[PDB]
Amino acid sequence: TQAEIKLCSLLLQEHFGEIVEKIGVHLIRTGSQPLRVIAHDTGTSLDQVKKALCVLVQHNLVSYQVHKRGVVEYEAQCSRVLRMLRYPRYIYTTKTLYSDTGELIVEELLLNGKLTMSAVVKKVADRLTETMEDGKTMDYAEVSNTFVRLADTHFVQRCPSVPTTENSDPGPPPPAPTLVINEKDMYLVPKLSLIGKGKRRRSSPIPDDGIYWQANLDRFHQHFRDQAIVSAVANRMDQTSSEIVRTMLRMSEITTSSSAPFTQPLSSNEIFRSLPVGYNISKQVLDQYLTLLADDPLEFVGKSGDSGGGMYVINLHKALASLATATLESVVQERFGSRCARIFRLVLQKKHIEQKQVEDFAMIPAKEAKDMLYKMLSENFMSLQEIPKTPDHAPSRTFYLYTVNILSAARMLLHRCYKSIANLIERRQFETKENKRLLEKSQRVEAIIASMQATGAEEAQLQEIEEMITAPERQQLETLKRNVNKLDASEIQVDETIFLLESYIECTMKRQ
Amino acid sequence: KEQFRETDVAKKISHICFGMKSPEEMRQQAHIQVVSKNLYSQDNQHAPLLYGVLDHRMGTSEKDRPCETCGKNLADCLGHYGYIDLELPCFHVGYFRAVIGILQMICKTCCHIMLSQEEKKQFLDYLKRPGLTYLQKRGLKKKISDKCRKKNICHHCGAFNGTVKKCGLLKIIHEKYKTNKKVVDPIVSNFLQSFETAIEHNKEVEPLLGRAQENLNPLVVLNLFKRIPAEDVPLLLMNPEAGKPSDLILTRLLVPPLCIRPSVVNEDDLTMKLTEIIFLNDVIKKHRISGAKTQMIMEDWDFLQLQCALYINSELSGIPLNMAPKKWTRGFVQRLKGKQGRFRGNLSGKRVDFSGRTVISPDPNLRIDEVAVPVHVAKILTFPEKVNKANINFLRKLVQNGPEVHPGANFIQQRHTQMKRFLKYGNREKMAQELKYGDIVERHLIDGDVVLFNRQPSLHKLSIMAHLARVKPHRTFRFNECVCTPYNADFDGDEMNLHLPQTEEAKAEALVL
Amino acid sequence: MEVKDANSALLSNYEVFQLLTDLKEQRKESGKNKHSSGQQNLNTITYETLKYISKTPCRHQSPEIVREFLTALKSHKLTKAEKLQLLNHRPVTAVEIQLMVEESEERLTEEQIEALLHTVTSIL
Amino acid sequence: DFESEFVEVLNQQCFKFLQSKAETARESKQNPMIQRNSSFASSHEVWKYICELGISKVELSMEDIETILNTLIYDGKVEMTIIAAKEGTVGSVDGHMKLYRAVNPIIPPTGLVRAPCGLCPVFDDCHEGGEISPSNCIYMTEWLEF
Amino acid sequence: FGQKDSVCGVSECIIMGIPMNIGTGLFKLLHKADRDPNPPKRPLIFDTNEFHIPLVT
Amino acid sequence: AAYTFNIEAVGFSKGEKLPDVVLKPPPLFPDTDYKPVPLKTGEGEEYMLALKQELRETMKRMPYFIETPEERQDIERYSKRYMKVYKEEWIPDWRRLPREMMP
Amino acid sequence: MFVLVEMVDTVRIPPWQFERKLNDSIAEELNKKLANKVVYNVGLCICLFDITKLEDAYVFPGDGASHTKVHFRCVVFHPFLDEILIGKIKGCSPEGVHVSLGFFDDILIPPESLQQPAKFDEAEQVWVWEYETEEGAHDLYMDTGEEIRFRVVDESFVDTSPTGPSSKEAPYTLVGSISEPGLGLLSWW
Amino acid sequence: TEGRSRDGGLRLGEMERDCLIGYGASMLLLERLMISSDAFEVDVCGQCGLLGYSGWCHYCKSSCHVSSLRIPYACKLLFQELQSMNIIPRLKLSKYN
Numbered sequence A: 001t002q003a004e005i006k007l008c009s010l011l012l013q014e015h016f017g018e019i020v021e022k023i024g025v026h027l028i029r030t031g032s033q034p035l036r037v038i039a040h041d042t043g044t045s046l047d048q049v050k051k052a053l054c055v056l057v058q059h060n061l062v063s064y065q066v067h068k069r070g071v072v073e074y075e076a077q078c079s080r081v082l083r084m085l086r087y088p089r090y091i092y093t094t095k096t097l098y099s100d101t102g103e104l105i106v107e108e109l110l111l112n113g114k115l116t117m118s119a120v121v122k123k124v125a126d127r128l129t130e131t132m133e134d135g136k137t138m139d140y141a142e143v144s145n146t147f148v149r150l151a152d153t154h155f156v157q158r159c160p161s162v163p164t165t166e167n168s169d170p171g172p173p174p175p176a177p178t179l180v181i182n183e184k185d186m187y188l189v190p191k192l193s194l195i196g197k198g199k200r201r202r203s204s205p206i207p208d209d210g211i212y213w214q215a216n217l218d219r220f221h222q223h224f225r226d227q228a229i230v231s232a233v234a235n236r237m238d239q240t241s242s243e244i245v246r247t248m249l250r251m252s253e254i255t256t257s258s259s260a261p262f263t264q265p266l267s268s269n270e271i272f273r274s275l276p277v278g279y280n281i282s283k284q285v286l287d288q289y290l291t292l293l294a295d296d297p298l299e300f301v302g303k304s305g306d307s308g309g310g311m312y313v314i315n316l317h318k319a320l321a322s323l324a325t326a327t328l329e330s331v332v333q334e335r336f337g338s339r340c341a342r343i344f345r346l347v348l349q350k351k352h353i354e355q356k357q358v359e360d361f362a363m364i365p366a367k368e369a370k371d372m373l374y375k376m377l378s379e380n381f382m383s384l385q386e387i388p389k390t391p392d393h394a395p396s397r398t399f400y401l402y403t404v405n406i407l408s409a410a411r412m413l414l415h416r417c418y419k420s421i422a423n424l425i426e427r428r429q430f431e432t433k434e435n436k437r438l439l440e441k442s443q444r445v446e447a448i449i450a451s452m453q454a455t456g457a458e459e460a461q462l463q464e465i466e467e468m469i470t471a472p473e474r475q476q477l478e479t480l481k482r483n484v485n486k487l488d489a490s491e492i493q494v495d496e497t498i499f500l501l502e503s504y505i506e507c508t509m510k511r512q
Numbered sequence B: 001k002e003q004f005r006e007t008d009v010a011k012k013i014s015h016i017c018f019g020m021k022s023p024e025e026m027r028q029q030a031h032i033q034v035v036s037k038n039l040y041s042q043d044n045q046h047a048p049l050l051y052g053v054l055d056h057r058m059g060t061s062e063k064d065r066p067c068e069t070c071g072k073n074l075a076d077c078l079g080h081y082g083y084i085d086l087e088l089p090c091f092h093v094g095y096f097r098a099v100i101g102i103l104q105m106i107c108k109t110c111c112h113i114m115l116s117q118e119e120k121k122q123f124l125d126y127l128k129r130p131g132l133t134y135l136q137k138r139g140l141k142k143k144i145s146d147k148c149r150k151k152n153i154c155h156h157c158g159a160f161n162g163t164v165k166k167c168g169l170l171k172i173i174h175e176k177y178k179t180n181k182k183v184v185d186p187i188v189s190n191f192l193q194s195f196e197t198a199i200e201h202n203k204e205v206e207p208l209l210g211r212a213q214e215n216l217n218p219l220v221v222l223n224l225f226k227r228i229p230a231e232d233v234p235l236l237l238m239n240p241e242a243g244k245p246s247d248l249i250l251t252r253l254l255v256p257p258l259c260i261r262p263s264v265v266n267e268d269d270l271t272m273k274l275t276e277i278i279f280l281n282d283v284i285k286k287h288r289i290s291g292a293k294t295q296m297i298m299e300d301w302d303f304l305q306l307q308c309a310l311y312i313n314s315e316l317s318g319i320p321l322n323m324a325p326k327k328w329t330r331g332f333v334q335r336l337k338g339k340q341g342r343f344r345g346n347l348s349g350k351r352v353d354f355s356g357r358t359v360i361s362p363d364p365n366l367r368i369d370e371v372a373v374p375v376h377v378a379k380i381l382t383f384p385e386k387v388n389k390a391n392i393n394f395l396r397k398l399v400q401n402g403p404e405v406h407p408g409a410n411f412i413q414q415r416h417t418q419m420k421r422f423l424k425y426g427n428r429e430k431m432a433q434e435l436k437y438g439d440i441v442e443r444h445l446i447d448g449d450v451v452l453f454n455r456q457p458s459l460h461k462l463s464i465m466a467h468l469a470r471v472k473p474h475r476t477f478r479f480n481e482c483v484c485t486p487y488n489a490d491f492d493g494d495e496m497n498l499h500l501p502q503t504e505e506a507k508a509e510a511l512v513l
Numbered sequence C: 001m002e003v004k005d006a007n008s009a010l011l012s013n014y015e016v017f018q019l020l021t022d023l024k025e026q027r028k029e030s031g032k033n034k035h036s037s038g039q040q041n042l043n044t045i046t047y048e049t050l051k052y053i054s055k056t057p058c059r060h061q062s063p064e065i066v067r068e069f070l071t072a073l074k075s076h077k078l079t080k081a082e083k084l085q086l087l088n089h090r091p092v093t094a095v096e097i098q099l100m101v102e103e104s105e106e107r108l109t110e111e112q113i114e115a116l117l118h119t120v121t122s123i124l
Numbered sequence D: 001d002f003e004s005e006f007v008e009v010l011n012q013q014c015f016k017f018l019q020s021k022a023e024t025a026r027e028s029k030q031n032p033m034i035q036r037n038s039s040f041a042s043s044h045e046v047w048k049y050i051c052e053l054g055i056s057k058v059e060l061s062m063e064d065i066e067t068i069l070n071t072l073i074y075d076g077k078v079e080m081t082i083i084a085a086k087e088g089t090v091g092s093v094d095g096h097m098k099l100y101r102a103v104n105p106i107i108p109p110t111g112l113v114r115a116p117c118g119l120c121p122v123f124d125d126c127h128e129g130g131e132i133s134p135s136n137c138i139y140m141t142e143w144l145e146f
Numbered sequence E: 001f002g003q004k005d006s007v008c009g010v011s012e013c014i015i016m017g018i019p020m021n022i023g024t025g026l027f028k029l030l031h032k033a034d035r036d037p038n039p040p041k042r043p044l045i046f047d048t049n050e051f052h053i054p055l056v057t
Numbered sequence F: 001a002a003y004t005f006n007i008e009a010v011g012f013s014k015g016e017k018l019p020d021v022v023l024k025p026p027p028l029f030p031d032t033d034y035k036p037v038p039l040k041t042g043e044g045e046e047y048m049l050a051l052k053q054e055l056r057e058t059m060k061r062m063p064y065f066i067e068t069p070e071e072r073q074d075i076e077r078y079s080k081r082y083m084k085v086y087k088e089e090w091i092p093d094w095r096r097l098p099r100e101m102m103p
Numbered sequence G: 001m002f003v004l005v006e007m008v009d010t011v012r013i014p015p016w017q018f019e020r021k022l023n024d025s026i027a028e029e030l031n032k033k034l035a036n037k038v039v040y041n042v043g044l045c046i047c048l049f050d051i052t053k054l055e056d057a058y059v060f061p062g063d064g065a066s067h068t069k070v071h072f073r074c075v076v077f078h079p080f081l082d083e084i085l086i087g088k089i090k091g092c093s094p095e096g097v098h099v100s101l102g103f104f105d106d107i108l109i110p111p112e113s114l115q116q117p118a119k120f121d122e123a124e125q126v127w128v129w130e131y132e133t134e135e136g137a138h139d140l141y142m143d144t145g146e147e148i149r150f151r152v153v154d155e156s157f158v159d160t161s162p163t164g165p166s167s168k169e170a171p172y173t174l175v176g177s178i179s180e181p182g183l184g185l186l187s188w189w
Numbered sequence H: 001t002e003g004r005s006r007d008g009g010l011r012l013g014e015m016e017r018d019c020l021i022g023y024g025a026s027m028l029l030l031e032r033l034m035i036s037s038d039a040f041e042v043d044v045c046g047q048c049g050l051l052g053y054s055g056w057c058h059y060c061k062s063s064c065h066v067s068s069l070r071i072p073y074a075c076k077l078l079f080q081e082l083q084s085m086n087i088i089p090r091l092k093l094s095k096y097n
Ligand code: SF4
Pocket: A423, D116, D117, D118, D120, D121, D122, D123, D126, D132, D133, D134, D137, D138, D139, D140
């Protein structure tokens, strides 16, 4: 995971600073370490180690346990640092499913890490004031009504809570309070009667104290997997079948695990009732749809039942295998061309094959077939087998069977995606560093135009910035801005490949 | 205008942290990329090519042609490296016994190490104590490989991990799909029936599909070793500051400079092996386009691995019979080991000059701290006496006597000039008038120079002492017979070595101690 | 060689003038030996640096001139590097103190700029 | 090989016919099960169509289009469904029938190939300070330009 | 393993060509030059602390 | 010249068409046939591009960003105090944090 | 534009100079070694200022010369960013106006920082500037080099060393601006 | 070289080195086994530990850490034979005093 350590170094250096990313990188790299050896093996002062560990544990980036003799051994989560990259997709999906208030709630959560309900609704009511005008203030109640709608839908959950020390070992305090996660009060919101209005930033005792809220990222990953399978069905069969699949996943939302090989079975009688009322459909056509999606060899659905008429399940691991296989063939198609993607799908479906068989099946000649075979061997997409005749394992006396294994190639593709995003972040930071002088000069001139713009802004000063020598390099500023915008957009859009690969590698594992 | 460069910093060397380079630091070390295969050009000029081996941007190996971006010579140039880009990765024949061990300790699927969290917490804490030596790390690697080889299932991904063992010269096999006489597991049952299209168009697959397992080639173990998390690397007992697990598979290869492989030995064996590695790289790069079979590709790849393995070590055991060398060549190990290698041959005891060897014969008329050096040896052995104020008038006479009369000199060196004017030619009375303070005159060995004196099987520390020499006409070293008891000399044709120290600190330490 | 401090103190050009003047006072009693090109480098850089400084307005100055100059200039809310340039260049008009002082038209009023010109011309 | 310059027109023409039939069946929109049954095209009807087009002088045998349609499937552009031959015009397969329908790919092209890092041929030689560095690449300088 | 080997021992001091610690290498010699440690400093005229109270509040 | 390995064990039973001797090393950046697929745009995909830039400009001003101090600065400038921004300091919940976190 | 730089160094005092007091010999040997050379990250050393601490004089084995570790300070031409200088013009170029500063030679003015009403030559060497009322397009930067006044806005360090196997660009390049009002030649303001 | 017919010169064996250790003659042993056999100046970079040339480390691309260092030629030959084998010796130089 050297690519993961490099990417986590870049993300911590961007979103927290330098003398915190040293601590984060060391905790990712070596592992469980007590507090004094984080100080000694890095070389920084102890107070900076304390501030860095507190700002990491605030955002739920490092965990801590209690061990023998009373030591506190910290430990960073590499996956939680990597999920800092998907924050604009989280803020966009909460703006999609909800209002701007639900956008700003998840924004304040992902930015502060842990907040109470009162603090986050105060900050949302404060920040909605700039979005409004003409005397209308935002109030706490309608923000809280969206906050409880998020808490009901489980996008937002409560942090693991402190134990009651009057009931749990009264006496001397332990070195660490030993937080425990309670399954009960995750989504039980504390009631609030305190209402108020947001300040307009003029520049001229807490009931839910200790109850902190964090964004539940696993629910966002479940919603993203839902949208992935829904768009897969929407691109294969039809829009109505896609809406039926969306309805089945919506009914499968609150009733199953985020990591389960098969979800709850659904009776078609309640699939019919759960559809939004805009569709003119019958029971029999719905039965046809379900039994023709069960006819699919991609098998997104399974029968798994006979009682109650139409009993239907949706598949999770087979659907994620189909999506990961589509990603793995899409990258081969775009890297080598269509005639090589043909060979990749051929070696995929026929599970084992030889060269003459590829040349016969694929309608691709010699010196162009084997060329693409060997290019895909040099990139770890396609494994050999070498069934041996003798135990000498000599190449002269054996048969070589091409083989595509989806798991190792998906891990390889994930390893390439991490290093890809790391390289894009490198290029963005290099361009900003080499043009920071013109950047700060532009900051100066926009601070000049910004000051007294509302009052007494003569038109002559607008020409005096254009008369200034920044105007030959406004071409360079536009080039820098479009380059930074394209690199940030690509840094966003590689995460769609990362999530579809990471879901498959996550679901093929048992953790026993 | 001119950049401040000075290096007379006078640090001494302290300790030598061994390690290994990644393939992408070899690119940062080397100067040229060796891609060509012919040594010298075609014509009569006999000059080497521009991007092959024997390129003189890798230093020089002859007095004629200097190092080709400066104008300074063979005697000063360290030599410089070039790198060969291998087309397909190969195992290193030295690190292969460690590649097997790393593969036996980690999961072959998710690339974590197969241990419980508690045993990792045990061994990582045992790696924290001070005073951890190399004996202790050698024990701890076996104690962790034992608890890794007793597990068959992964505690992290859940997949199965069979035994990994060496199945010959530079091949690694992994038994993932072992069978039993019991109820067949699903994970082996799917793999046994996955051979459908191979069974359809071939007959002999069907008996041989029981012996099929996972073949680990460098294309796969280089892929695996890139995914080992850096938390799990010290449990493989590697210091991650001195090496990485990805570095044990070579995919780029340094070539030694010309001062390590002399072009007139014609060419050294390492130059031939590097030429053959470049040739096999071109052969595979052409057969990836010309559509040769997998038999020819894998055979050539095996050759690429066998040539690198013979490049590093030319005494392998399990060499296949159609691929062995015809002649015996010095690899790097065979120019390290042996009786005439680097260590035992050149580091431990090395030959010295300013020495002599003559038969001894007795002479009691000398004092006990004098040895009588013959004239025909004292005209050859010289001591460099720097000119100063006390002995200018002595060294003018010893320059005027030349190299043939005995109290004379053989050379002369100017102050800030390192060239030695040999003192036979030139009107020597002109060179005797041009002596400045600080010139170095290599005078003959005269009466009173400290010289060392040694009988060859050196039992105790008085087998080598220092006498004050005196020159005498006959051809034997003549010392007093009272000194025969330390040397255990016997005057029956015995020879005793002479050593003349060349530095005033060496004279004084010899004379006092 | 090793640098403990790349920027330890700023220097007026009068200190460097006095340094090269005192270096000239004890030099050239024993000529170069042609044993190294170090004396050639020292002679050229000392000579040419003193020849450049000898056409600057840092000649005819003294220690106590700089003392009273910083004394009279202390009460004007200026930086170190601005007082350095004002000491070195001897400005005589107002167009160049607009250059040597950053945000001249925003910190310094025109009467303060004229008082600054008078303060500079009154001492040097 | 039969010919590599010749299959390049059949692999497009069969896809045009299948996409035309899927277009007509989609614009039918009467009964979606009946629409899906009308989406399946016969293995024999497509042979009768291509041989009626008559681009080659050599006669296009049915067993040859039986493998030409495999290259249509293996490019990920059509499926294949095997049913029993209860009813059939010819019955080229004894007791069974082969059907083909024009499909679309499952997902858009992935986000990895949108960045030029996903298509690099020297990807394993790129590091921060080396020769091939992201701060001085050519593929990004071409990619960031237009 | 990357095990770092010292060159404090005698035999590797003989190999690496550095003078060893036994014998006439246990101590260090100093020259008794006519020297003056901590000589008087040339005065700074411009940059002292008394003339340069900082600008920012 | 002849080799240590037999060429016949590699191939070349005719003994001709040996792979050519390369004069110049290949260039650092080989020309690729293919290009990246152009990016996805839209009214939803563009909002993430602006929100991601808002995250940098916000989190650099938040108190969680531990500033690195300025070091060995050459001169102090009046344009320097335009750069320096004082910021209020957050306080950790000491009940959730262990005891050794206290300064 | 001159700074003190506190440096430490080992000074090899040869043994024929033992008759002379050590402080004078250290100053002589450091002036023979640091003068007129560009130290990589601090600038151009003019001459020694003083010696501030002088440690003990070791004698290393194999050499009779006494080495000693010297704490000293040295004056260095290192003009900080946004600083006004005056200097002569050496010559004009298609890349810009090469400005001499007495002892120091490589101060380049780019065309993008020249004064904006004229930025181009008529395939002539000498760079020009145009004002409408007087001296239209015939004003010029004379190669005799009357004193101009510029403003350094960039400095660059390259580590000029023999790149490649062994055994002329300037290591201290300095780029200024002239485009501000009041700068340029001293004859213009 | 080796023998009398090549005008070769004698051999400080493995036993005369021991006898010179026994006297404590440090500089004589240094002079014999380095200066009168094979003297050679390398330049070792102090940061990366690799060898360089002319006060310039090609690896790091800098001149601010290299040091002059007297070394036998057999030792440099050993170090370059080891770097060719991808066993890297990284010479961490401390200091005098
Ligand atoms: S950094 Fe450059 S060379 Fe490396 S993957 Fe990206 S585009 Fe390719």
